[PDB]
Design a protein around this ligand. Structure first.
Ligand SMILES: O=C(O)C1Cc2ccccc2C1
Length: 167
């Protein structure tokens, strides 16, 4: 049994809810919240900007030190950093950004990072301002992630479209 409430069950392991991931993290304090990161961990906008704002910029301070030491992530890759006030840990995952021209086949590789964690609160990778089709992102998620994932979708209109169209 876990703390996640109000989710619709899509499969054995994937659950979905219309929710602000920031507000959901604040309530649940999950072991792992996923950030929709870029390779530079520059948390300017979208989910990353919102998560970072909720940490009072501490996520960005920590991230800048991580990049200064380790250099940029790979598209499709990830790193585990602090969850600050939102979660125990933040898994920063880089999905391909279609608005920068990145290979969408890298979306499966991005979701494979989730399999290293038993339970996660996450957004749809590459969706929103990353330019991918969120329906596609949800299909790759379900067909790739084997661990228990709680997907928070910010847009209500999109949530309803994702549920109604889910196979
Ligand atoms: O409505 C949503 O949940 C989308 C908003 C957003 C922004 C940047 C990255 C992913 C997503 C998912």
């Amino acid at each position: 049994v876990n703390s996640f409430s109000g989710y619709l069950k899509l499969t054995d392991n994937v659950y979905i809810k219309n929710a602000d991931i920031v507000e959901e993290a604040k309530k649940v304090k999950p072991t792992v919240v996923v950030n929709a990161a870029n390779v530079y961990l520059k948390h300017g906008g979208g989910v990353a900007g919102a998560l970072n704002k909720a940490t009072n910029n501490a996520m960005q301070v920590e991230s800048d030190d991580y990049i200064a030491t380790n250099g940029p992530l790979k598209v499709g890759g990830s790193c585990v950093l602090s969850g600050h006030n939102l979660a125990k840990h933040c898994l920063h995952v880089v999905g391909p950004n279609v608005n920068k021209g990145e290979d969408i086949q890298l979306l499966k590789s991005a979701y494979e990072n989730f399999n290293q964690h038993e339970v996660l609160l996450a957004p749809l990778l590459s969706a929103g301002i990353f330019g991918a089709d969120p329906i596609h992102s949800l299909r790759v998620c379900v067909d790739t992630v084997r661990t228990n994932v709680y997907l928070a979708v910010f847009d209500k209109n999109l949530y309803d479209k994702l549920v109604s169209s889910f196979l």
